[PDB]
Symmetry: C5
Subunit: 211 residues, 5 copies
């Protein structure tokens, strides 16, 4: 048997996707996320919505999906379908349409249990857009990523990279459109409405000025 | 075996989603629902429809999905996929398009059998919108949630929170659009057209005035 | 074991959805349908199409899905997923878009074998719409429901209610739009193009006048 | 056991849908197709596309799905789900959008192995549309049906009816729109770009003149 | 048993789609791709996007899906569903909408392990489109195909045909629209942002001038 088949069987023959992947339920499943803005397709002042094509990547630890490489021909990482494992319900609020985003089939996994998921997002978000300074307008829209259902005690959200590095990330931006990206400011806040439930969310402020 | 895996197996290995989850068929499955209006994307007087992005949550009791925590490492609640259990067919009438709403994978469950489902709704509804007072127009549109098929003897709908608390809920509303939310008035009515079938529905009146 | 679980197992453990549910293949599967017009969202004279939100219900007999209540705690009816049983391919011709209609998960079943399916339809249909009498225009569009594939010898279509009762049904119509419903006239005709195939269809004429 | 259940089991318990249904791989799977134009919803000169609602039917031979009627209560034909058998990948080129077409669940089968599939098509096609003779314009758009992947040695396309009968078929056309159908001219051609691959396609020229 | 059934069983009874199909994980899975532009449906200068209907074909080697023909009635190639095997996640960046593309069910396979996949693409891409020379405008938009997740060490992209042959390929182009195709220039580049990850992508520049 090839090493990849042996590893895939050893991992997925005694694993189910319904549960949260932690040996002890008392610890939360920390999730690290990163956001890169690839392009700004449209900014609609009439409907007060804008469309952003952002490259979204996140990683977390699956305490069940771990192995010793030396028993599997020194395989340090491998790719398996995303639908065959647990995936956090980290969803972006303020959204109005996300069907344009295709579902990426595969995700990378490492022998430590770390799971890496790279996916695109064609999300269109609703935010306040004033046209007061139309000729030299500058807008401030926010993207907030949160565990839609799980509380902070179950899922927590952190940053993959340092805040300053992602704040001035224009490496892959399409810098030929009507809008110019000035920065992507992250922000962490604990969101709570009930007297006992606290939810963790990460706000990304996309700052753009017209040209 | 970890406690979560043992509990998930003990629950879902002797459970099927086709049936209504009640030990005795003679009792109805009471469902408690709540509605929070997150934003009002569009109000179309031409087509007599308006779009509301509302945060919808509901809970009910699954008399099969109950356990004693002390036998499962004091696990009081856990999350499992929504497609692995019975879910009431509580659908909103007056609707014209609901495909924009994504399907939330997971739902929370407690050892008492209570099931909590949090989902978003991008429903666009058809209702009478007069433009008689255009400059200072005030509109009155209604959202009615009902068990589409099940009668009152099978599914009944109630309110999660007290009517007054939800009537003046502007905690998460996007209060920067063209429309301002004045209140969300609930109302319970037994709907019957045949001589023997009674259906329970809950009407939510979204009161909005232009600005 | 609870009665519902026992009944569901007894029914679906020896049943498959591919076949037409009849003990003898020589008899047709009579289907009774009813149509209620809930609203008329749009009437497009430019594209010669109109959109109707109609509440559609139908029932038929599954000769396999029958039981004696006294052996199942006097259960006279129960609900199971619609995808777990055979469903007739009764489709509406003249259609141009039906994706807006959501798929109802559950259907009601009775111990006699009768299956009741209640579903909504957001169908937009193409029909001749003249604007000759624009100010006082009256239109005559038709909805025809037919077994798309099965012939009359396999599937036949009938009326749930008497023709006169459905002809003057304005009980749930949204009587506040630009159009007023005058009647819904049914009509049964055997449709045949080949020399040996006869298909049964039921035409519903929606009569509307502007206001 | 009822005859239908016995036949369905005998057929589908030793059958899989992945393969091409032929006892000997050396023979092609001849497919006969027919096209009936039900209506012409739109003809867009701006985008150089037109929408045609055509009734599409095809049949082919499944050498595995054959039986002797006398052993199954003289059952000469039966209907089973289309997703439970092999279906040719006969797709229409020049297309721009086909999502509007619903998926028909069932297909008819005969004891000889013949499979009959009736499905609708809401295809919108891109073709050259000149507006030179606008007031009395006549257009010539083409629909070509081909085995998208399989070569002629695997799948071949033929005509269900004689070319002249389908060429003057206006039996079910909606002859009340802006366009009038003059004919549907078929044409068979072997399409080859590589030095060894030949693909069979059938071109249907829809001839229409404005009125 | 027919040869096709025996071969399909022998192949798919000891094969799973999750893993990358290579006997040794240390070697990359080279993928050869080709692009043919069938038509240019729309070029939107307002939204800075254009729609291209391109015929996309690719092939790769599955080291598990190989056999000796002489043991299977000299079967040199056969077709099986695309969802039953591993398929590379070769996705086109700069995209804005790909849902219009239908999913081709079957793919061709040869006894050497080679897998051939032919699929259409209705991708709409975002690229800089200047209207400076409107009357005689010439545009330069790019399509880049990359392994979205897998690095170069896992998936690599090459050209099926020689660069010059694909650069002047107008064999199946719809040369009757507003735009004329001047060439499709390929280009290979190793894309890397992290200090250790290198991804292989192939850029196709579609050169078009108005007429
Ligand atoms: C959830 O994650 C956030 C972000 O990683 C945590 O907030 C940080 O916690 C560390 C350690 O307590 C502090 O040094 C930082 O100042 C906090 N803020 C940020 C922005 O890093 C938070 O403590 C985590 N909570 C739980 C329950 O895991
Ligand atoms: C866009 O909005 C964000 C959030 O309100 C602004 O970020 C804050 O700016 C204030 C300015 O005094 C700082 O004190 C905060 O520390 C910032 N917060 C974060 C998380 O960075 C941002 O400045 C706004 N941009 C523009 C151009 O107005
Ligand atoms: C279905 O639920 C509704 C709402 O919970 C019930 O209506 C209430 O019933 C209680 C007790 O009978 C009354 O005190 C309230 O005044 C009723 N109205 C409201 C708005 O709470 C109804 O009785 C339930 N019916 C069934 C069959 O369960
Ligand atoms: C919007 O419509 C609702 C329902 O018709 C109104 O709510 C009712 O208002 C009347 C006013 O006399 C009260 O007597 C009822 O008790 C109310 N019913 C409920 C369930 O609250 C509401 O007032 C309307 N709003 C506006 C601004 O006209
Ligand atoms: C298919 O159903 C239709 C409608 O139920 C049948 O047509 C009726 O048949 C009865 C009895 O023969 C007549 O009394 C009615 O006048 C017919 N028309 C209507 C509108 O009810 C038809 O006979 C059925 N055919 C088959 C083969 O079952
Ligand atoms: C709309 O069209 C239907 C069908 O053509 C009309 O219904 C027929 O009307 C004629 C009038 O003489 C009657 O003789 C038929 O018996 C009717 N058929 C049915 C099935 O009811 C209807 O009258 C038309 N409505 C309008 C307003 O013109
Ligand atoms: C594929 O099918 C086409 C159409 O049925 C075949 O073309 C016909 O072949 C017959 C017999 O050779 C001729 O008499 C006709 O003149 C041909 N044309 C038409 C329009 O019928 C073709 O031979 C078939 N090829 C294969 C390999 O099966
Ligand atoms: C539409 O185009 C088709 C295909 O080019 C035409 O059909 C051909 O017409 C020529 C006229 O001399 C004949 O010689 C061919 O035999 C026809 N081919 C087929 C397959 O029928 C058709 O005439 C065109 N229609 C119009 C109105 O121009
Ligand atoms: C990935 O594939 C590309 C293209 O096939 C390779 O690049 C070529 O490599 C060959 C041999 O090293 C050179 O002769 C060519 O000049 C290269 N460029 C092109 C455009 O062909 C690349 O080496 C491959 N890399 C890996 C790791 O497999
Ligand atoms: C469109 O853009 C491509 C890429 O920038 C151009 O292709 C390059 O053109 C330069 C011209 O000096 C050559 O030196 C490069 O070798 C070309 N690269 C490739 C990969 O072919 C192309 O010329 C542009 N077309 C137009 C009309 O401007
Ligand atoms: C009173 C109150 C309680 C809770 C909430 S929150 C919420 C409500 C419904 C559906 C989903 C949510 N969310 C939970 C955490 N993830 C984001 C959405 C509110 C608004 C009021
Ligand atoms: C005469 C009559 C009987 C019943 C109804 S109701 C209905 C009809 C068709 C499809 C669905 C329904 N519903 C049932 C309960 N849930 C909401 C929809 C009518 C209108 C007339
Ligand atoms: C000559 C001829 C034969 C049959 C028909 S019918 C048809 C054709 C193709 C696809 C579907 C159908 N239908 C069958 C019954 N259900 C409605 C649609 C025609 C038009 C001509
Ligand atoms: C050089 C060359 C070779 C083959 C083709 S064909 C093609 C190409 C890609 C994807 C699909 C196809 N098709 C095959 C048969 N069915 C219709 C589409 C071309 C254009 C050039
Ligand atoms: C700092 C940095 C690191 C990696 C990338 S890449 C990327 C990021 C998120 C999601 C997907 C990707 N991709 C990987 C390879 N395939 C194309 C997309 C960037 C932009 C910055
Ligand atoms: C795996 O790695 C260890 C440490 O580098 C080495 O000793 C061993 O030979 C390797 N085994 C294989 C099969 O590569
Ligand atoms: C569970 O809770 C009970 C009561 O608080 C306690 O006695 C017991 O030790 C707990 N068990 C575990 C495993 O935490
Ligand atoms: C079922 O109904 C019959 C007739 O009414 C009655 O005699 C019997 O006791 C009932 N059984 C149960 C369990 O309700
Ligand atoms: C089947 O048909 C044959 C020939 O017509 C006849 O002899 C036989 O009795 C039939 N059997 C049944 C069960 O109808
Ligand atoms: C397969 O091909 C070989 C070589 O051409 C030939 O000897 C053999 O007879 C063939 N077998 C069949 C079954 O065609």
């Amino acid at each position: 048997r090839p090493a990849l088949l042996r590893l895939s069987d050893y991992l997925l023959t005694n694993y189910r996707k319904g549960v949260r992947p932690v040996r002890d339920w008392r610890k939360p499943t920390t999730v690290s996320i990163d956001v890169i803005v690839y392009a700004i397709l449209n900014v609609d002042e009439k409907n007060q919505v804008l469309t952003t094509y952002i490259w979204y990547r996140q990683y977390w630890t699956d305490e069940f999906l771990q192995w010793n490489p030396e028993d599997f021909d020194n395989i340090t990482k491998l790719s398996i379908p995303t639908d065959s494992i647990w995936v956090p319900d980290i969803l972006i609020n303020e959204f109005v349409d996300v069907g344009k985003s295709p579902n990426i089939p595969y995700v990378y996994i490492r022998h430590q249990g770390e799971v890496q998921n790279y996916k695109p997002l064609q999300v269109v978000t609703a935010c306040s857009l004033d046209i007061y300074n139309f000729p030299f307008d500058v807008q401030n829209c926010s993207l907030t990523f949160t565990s839609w259902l799980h509380t902070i005690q179950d899922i927590n959200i952190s940053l993959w990279r340092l805040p300053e590095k992602v704040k001035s990330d224009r490496s892959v931006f399409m810098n030929q459109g009507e809008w110019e990206l000035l920065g992507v400011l992250p922000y962490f806040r604990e969101f709570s409405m009930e007297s006992s439930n606290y939810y963790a969310e990460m706000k990304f402020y996309v700052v753009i000025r017209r040209r």
